[PDB]
Amino acid sequence: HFYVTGPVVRGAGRGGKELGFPTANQYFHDTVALPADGVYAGWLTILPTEAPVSGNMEPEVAYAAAISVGTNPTFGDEQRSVESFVLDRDADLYGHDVKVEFVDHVRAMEKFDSVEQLLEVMAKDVQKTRTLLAQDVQAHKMAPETYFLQA
Ligand SMILES: Cc1cc2nc3c(=O)[nH]c(=O)nc-3n(C[C@H](O)[C@H](O)[C@H](O)COP(=O)(O)O)c2cc1C
Ligand SMILES: Nc1ncnc2c1ncn2[C@@H]1O[C@H](COP(=O)(O)OP(=O)(O)O)[C@@H](O)[C@H]1O
Ligand SMILES: [Mg+2]
Numbered sequence: 001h002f003y004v005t006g007p008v009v010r011g012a013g014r015g016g017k018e019l020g021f022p023t024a025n026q027y028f029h030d031t032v033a034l035p036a037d038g039v040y041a042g043w044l045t046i047l048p049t050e051a052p053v054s055g056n057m058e059p060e061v062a063y064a065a066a067i068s069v070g071t072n073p074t075f076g077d078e079q080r081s082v083e084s085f086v087l088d089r090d091a092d093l094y095g096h097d098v099k100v101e102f103v104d105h106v107r108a109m110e111k112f113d114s115v116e117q118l119l120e121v122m123a124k125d126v127q128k129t130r131t132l133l134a135q136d137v138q139a140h141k142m143a144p145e146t147y148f149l150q151a
């Protein structure tokens, strides 16, 4: 899969608290190759580290993630981000170097008229992501210790 690596950094502060979908934000210079803006199913891995990870994620495990690439046009954000909602987990990822692999495209990035409309679609994105990643596990015969995909 195409992938990017970089530290998880601070965004607008709205994902978890306003939308109920915390996103681990990464920002890249405009020279770095990314997939098209859009929503993706993929895997987020905390790279090997001696830094302690607070919460229920550990290094070197591929966690199922629903991923956004773009400028969050519903909100009118100013920089392109890669943003990963890690399914069914809760950890403090700020400052940790992570790898994000883009496995499947789910849909185009969209400017919604309201947060309600966006959340309705994000629920479907997450459901699709579960299904698509389950297929990926089978396609690569991934060893259970190496990934996390709840239910
Ligand atoms: C699966 C998924 C789908 C998303 N789809 C869209 C979208 O269609 N349009 C949009 O403007 N933002 C989209 N986003 C981005 C959210 O707007 C963004 O994660 C949220 O505003 C939190 O921003 P923050 O991390 O800077 O706090 C999506 C995020 C995720 C995780
Ligand atoms: N399931 C999860 N997926 C992504 N980030 C999570 C998750 N659980 C906790 N977090 C933490 O929440 C932060 C993202 O929340 P968010 O509201 O999007 O803040 P920000 O605007 O700073 O990105 C991450 O950087 C990470 O530290
Ligand atoms: Mg975020």
Ligand SMILES: [Zn+2]
Pocket (backbone or CB within 6 Å): 001, 103, 136, 139, 140
């Ligand atoms: Zn694959």
